[model samples]
Target: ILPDSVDWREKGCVTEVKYQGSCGASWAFSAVGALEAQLKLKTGKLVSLSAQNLVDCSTEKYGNKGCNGGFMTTAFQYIIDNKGIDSDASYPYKAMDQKCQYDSKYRAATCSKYTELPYGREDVLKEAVANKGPVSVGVDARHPSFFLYRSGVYYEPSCTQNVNHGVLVVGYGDLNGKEYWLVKNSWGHNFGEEGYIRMARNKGNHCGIASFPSYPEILQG
Candidate 1:
């Protein structure tokens, strides 16, 4: 039984919206943001994990492209392999690919495993968000209307399943009879509704929203 609305922000599990600058590390931000929520749920502390940590380290064998691009699944594996990830206050985000500066002493959070929801299944995605906090998902954000979105439920008629961008699905609810997936963006706070976007929901995975949804599994301490 899932609620009609579920906002992790109201639950204090979500951190501040991040700015990815010119770097194409939205995948890192999405993965780290979802992990931040998982960490907060277990430790009762909402700390920002380092996207830069993944951008710098989760490469080669992990199959991430640093500033160029990345995948949420691989980022989770990187954290699992490294045992933990650093806080943004320490490692921080430079918006560029630097040498991996991961330190166990600065480790803020660690996940034992991760799970990927079925592709093209918004129903399953909604259920996951309602029960498991925030989830990292892919989107077809190659349209100007999406990048320039302001308010209300966003929908581009020409949007396809290109799935070039990654974002965090924080919540879902109906707004004035229109349902939407409250998403957190990585292009900074001024980009959309304070760094968030209401993507049209229950619309057959509009813009490939539910194509690659996944989240890290946090082990309680």
Candidate 2:
């Protein structure tokens, strides 16, 4: 039996698609998307937050490498410490290495708090995404098949918690008789389902996706 699906895209909780280029900065994009959705669901305002802000500034302070690799928790913690992240129109995506250029003038969205869901729990992830909007997650993108993935429910036979890329979980559903978590990729619109992928869900935290799901807490006032 499958649970009723929730589609954030249909609910207007999803944001514009992004392209990360050759950089390994999906972590920033995914985390930023989650914050954007959180802010939108909380304030009825849709603001494009800057992933480049984290790509450039979340180094020594947060322990994430820019354009190299990073963790969602590190990005979230950086926002909490730095006050608020900037809007994309102001900061924009460079998709390459650069110095930290964050300025107070570019700040747009701020979160009161952020936290991860219970590790390796699909039910908890469903509850969070249904109640919230989207969650930033890590996945094992090391396999070349993932790079070429285009359709169907992706079930990695070699999936593990050892992840390499970050993606946003926008929704979940049973597609073509297979259950999956709808994931938004930062690989531009040329990838699966217009920059999205139906990742295997309820499959023992496939690819560390469910194991490290996280989201932001918005403040309304």
Candidate 3:
């Protein structure tokens, strides 16, 4: 059975992968998160998807070369245009040292058709949970603890680093009597609520978290 904290079984439960400390790999995480969700919905099995594969295998056409900070929408477009991406097992992880190899067979993203973006991602996300599945998003975490989030209550300070990472919005619900987005962070399994973090769902502090899906695509099942 799925946890109540999760929204939908089909869209919820994504295999949260760590991107380590690679800057600009947010593009990789965002792309892999979306692709992983689509793969799970299509196959009904949760596979350990790879962000390293995306970082090393996705074409430069998407501007995803590691530390370049590319948009998630562009990465999605690359997938739709390229047919598909391969598993990390096939391409392997090399951080940000090499360029994509462009393998068509084991590719995780399928570029057979172009996808459309539904307006108002927050509303679209609600609908996706009700219909399709969980959605992945990027946020501007301008909090200090977010940068030094090494395993403890996330605290906001002025010394935090800039937003250079990404994670999945697996589910949303009330916790501790507060409405929050149940975020699956990539800071390993020992950090923040056990590899998870909470953001105010109503207030706009973490609203940028929802900005990524400000434009979203429906991966056809």
Give the TM-score of each candidate.
Answer: 0.98, 0.95, 0.76
Error of 2 at 43 (Å): 2.7
How well is each residue in 61-139 modelled by candidate 2, as lDDT tens digits? 7879889888888898888888989999899998887898899887888877888887788899998888877989888
TM-score of 2: 0.95
- Measured by TM-score, the strongest candidate is 1
Q: Lowest-scoring 10 consecutive residues by lDDT in candidate 3?
A: 153-162
lDDT of 3 by residue, 22-102 (tens): 556666676666566667666666655556655664546676665556666666666666566667677665556465676
Q: Order of all candidates by lDDT, from best down to worst?
A: 1, 2, 3
Candidate achieving higher lDDT, 2 or 3: 2
| Clash pairs (backbone) in predicted model 1 | none
Q: lDDT per prediction?
A: 0.93, 0.87, 0.57
